Amino acid sequence: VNSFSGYLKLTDNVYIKNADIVEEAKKVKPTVVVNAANVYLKHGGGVAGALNKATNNAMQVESDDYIATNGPLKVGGSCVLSGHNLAKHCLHVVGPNVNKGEDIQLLKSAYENFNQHEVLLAPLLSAGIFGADPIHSLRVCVDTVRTNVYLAVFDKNLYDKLVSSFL
Ligand SMILES: OC[C@@H]1CC2(CCOCC2)CN1c1ncnc2[nH]ccc12
């Protein structure tokens, strides 16, 4: 039993809700919140911009030190950093950005990072400003993630469309 509330159950391990991931994180304080990161950890917009703003830029400060030491992530890769005031940890995961010409097959590799954590709050990788089809993102998620994932879907029309089209 966990403290996630109001989610629709899609499969044995995948749950979904229309929610602002920032407000969800602030309520639940999950062990892991997933960020829709880029390889440079520059949290300018989308989910990443929102989560960073909610940390008063502390996420960006920590991220800049991470990059200075380790260099950029790989597309499809991840790193674990602090969750600041939002969660215990933040798993920064880089899904392919279609608006950069990045390979969509890497989306499965991106979701594989979730399997290293028993429970996560997360957005749909590569959706929104990353330019991929959110219906496809949800499908790859369901077919790749085996741990317990609670998906927060921002757009209402996106959420109802995601539920009504789910196979
Ligand atoms: O789940 C991925 C979605 C996709 C998105 C861009 C395209 O469609 C509109 C929404 C932004 N994402 C978010 N999801 C949950 N919480 C969020 N907070 C701020 C953004 C955000």
CATH number for 48? 3.40.220.10
CA of 145 from ligand 1 middle (Å) equals 19
Mutual angle of helices 46-54 and 58-70, in 10-degree steps: 120
Does 2 reside within a domain? no
Task: Answer whether 21 contacts ligand 1 (Cβ < 6 A).
Answer: yes
Q: Phi and psi of 23, rounded to 5°?
A: -65, -35
Q: How far is CA 56 from CA 51, 53, 145, 154, in A?
A: 9, 5, 31, 21
Does 1 reside within a domain? no
CA of 8 from ligand 1 middle (Å) equals 18
Number of separate domains in the chain: 1
Contact 78, 113 (CB under 8 A): yes
Query: Ligand 1: which residue has its CA nearest to atom 1?
Result: 123
CA of 94 from ligand 1 middle (Å) equals 15
Does 71 reside within a domain? yes
Does 120 reside within a domain? yes
Q: What strands, in cross-sheet order, belong to the sheet with 148-153?
A: 8-9, 14-18, 148-153, 119-122, 32-36, 89-93, 78-82
Does 25 reside within a domain? yes
Q: How was this structure determined?
A: X-ray
Whole domain around residue 115: which residue ranges? 8-163
Runs of H (alpha helix) within 113-155? 134-144
From the CA of 47, give the closest atom in ligand 1.
Answer: 20
